[PDB]
Curated annotation (Swiss-Prot), chain B:
It is an enzyme of class 2 (transferase). Changing residue 36 to A: Loss of kinase activity at low concentrations of ATP. This is Death-associated protein kinase 3. Widely expressed. Isoform 1 and isoform 2 are expressed in the bladder smooth muscle. Pyridone 6 binds at residues 88, 90. The lineage of its organism: Eukaryota, Metazoa, Chordata, Craniata, Vertebrata. It comes from Homo sapiens (Human). Changing residue 106 to M: In a colorectal adenocarcinoma sample; somatic mutation; greatly reduces kinase activity, increases cell proliferation and cell survival. Changing residue 205 to S: In a lung neuroendocrine carcinoma sample; somatic mutation; greatly reduces kinase activity, increases cell proliferation, cell adhesion and cell survival.
Length: 265, 266
């Protein structure tokens, strides 16, 4: 990698990884180099297993959409897999919105549409992100008139595809009744993101992580007027149709885009 | 290295998911092995070949394992089109075929083979590896032409390491993630119950007339011991089976408990 990219400042660090800014030799174009520490022994809990690195890389390879982070190049050395990624410098969407004194529902929906467009692309390729949250919703450049959303961090993303067992004769009840996680999980996350984007309030947050998890499982939220008095009924309906316990009864991404609140712009 | 530079390749032995198995012999030692050639999926291909992720997952499992009752990985090569696993040659066929050839087979003899299965699984589970496909066709013998044949568990194509897992905020996670119950080592213990039931009786506990019936029967744990298939089976053996065919995975015998059970231990 160092033969081909000049490495600069550390930008941050996450799950067994350090991100540095870099510049490609010959072209001068800037990127983010994410150095992922490989797991050595399969018994270890340090680093990332090769198979999990591959899972993420295989998803990143396929992505070509303006609202998603792009993979440019990949290297591997003794200790690391280095992803050369699109440099996204505009920060978290919510930190940009914080510079404002207030935000209108129409200003918010400009951004929400971009998130939905990114997720529509991912879901069209059967990719569930599984960790949609405001910190993974960045901006390419926050100083332009109409900033562009970039979805980041495919660390737990999966392709969503019985036959592997040959027949079911020997399989346990938990396999018979296995209900896989799927694309609907992202649609729930979108509901929560929308809720907080519009109101500033987190719908399920409790005093401990355990309380939050309890609240989520019970679908225990409201639209209290202290937070929702300037929010439209169509916005509330959109959220209601996402925050559904049964994943099979939630709006899909296509239905989300066809919802009157979104169609209206 | 290229595989042909180290191994003389021989005749074809079988086929797997986008795979061919050939007998081979190591140059420099004369020792025979099974070479499994797995076709890699191209980046432009949707369904042809096996994904790199799936090959790595299985290989990383195989690399870790060494135990007398599990197939051993000896070498790995990769060329343009394939990943090639050089595996221990397991020549003795299916356990159940060998047993079906015996004039008679006592419960004591059956338990001794079953113990070898348990020993292999005990090792796998000690590494947090669930096999997930334990069934007769994956229980082979190394060499059937010896007084006491050695069981070899094969086919780690759906095996997985087993690890509420959320390091950051849980605020945006869906209820199905909050309530997610992953498949675990207990699933293998269920399979061992079914294997044992068939081993002793020749009947299958949950098999229905259609796939849906089999599924329904498993989920309901709807089985019994027919009087005229279990007439020569001990209550102690039935107890072993009963403690494995339990709906709640948390209430099934673990591999350690299975080995401590008096059917095995006595």
């Amino acid at each position: 990698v160092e033969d081909h990219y000049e490495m600069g400042e550390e930008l941050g660090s996450g799950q067994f990884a350090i991100v540095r800014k870099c510049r490609q030799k010959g072209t001068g174009k800037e990127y983010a180099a994410k150095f992922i520490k490989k797991r050595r022994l399969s018994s270890s809990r340090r680093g990332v297993s090769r198979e999990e690195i591959e899972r993420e890389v295989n998803i990143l390879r396929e992505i070509r959409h303006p609202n998603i982070i792009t993979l440019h190049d990949i290297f591997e050395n003794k200790t690391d897999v280095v992803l050369i990624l699109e440099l996204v410098s505009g920060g978290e969407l919510f930190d940009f919105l914080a510079e404002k004194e207030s935000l209108t529902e129409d200003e918010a929906t400009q951004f929400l549409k971009q998130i939905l467009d990114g997720v529509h692309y991912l879901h069209s390729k059967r990719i569930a992100h599984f960790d949609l949250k405001p910190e993974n919703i960045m901006l390419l450049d926050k100083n332009v008139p109409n900033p562009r959303i970039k979805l980041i961090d495919f660390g737990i993303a999966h392709k969503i595809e019985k036959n592997i067992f040959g027949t079911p004769e020997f399989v346990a009840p938990e396999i018979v009744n296995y209900e896989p996680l799927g694309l609907e999980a992202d649609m729930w996350s979108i509901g929560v993101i929308t809720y907080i984007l519009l109101s500033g309030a987190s719908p399920f947050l409790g005093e401990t992580k355990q309380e939050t998890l309890t609240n989520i499982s019970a679908v225990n939220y409201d639209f209290d007027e202290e937070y929702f008095s300037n929010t439209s009924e169509l916005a509330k309906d959109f959220i209601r149709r996402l925050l559904v316990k049964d994943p099979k009864r939630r709006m899909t991404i296509a239905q989300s885009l066809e919802h009157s609140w979104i169609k209206a712009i």
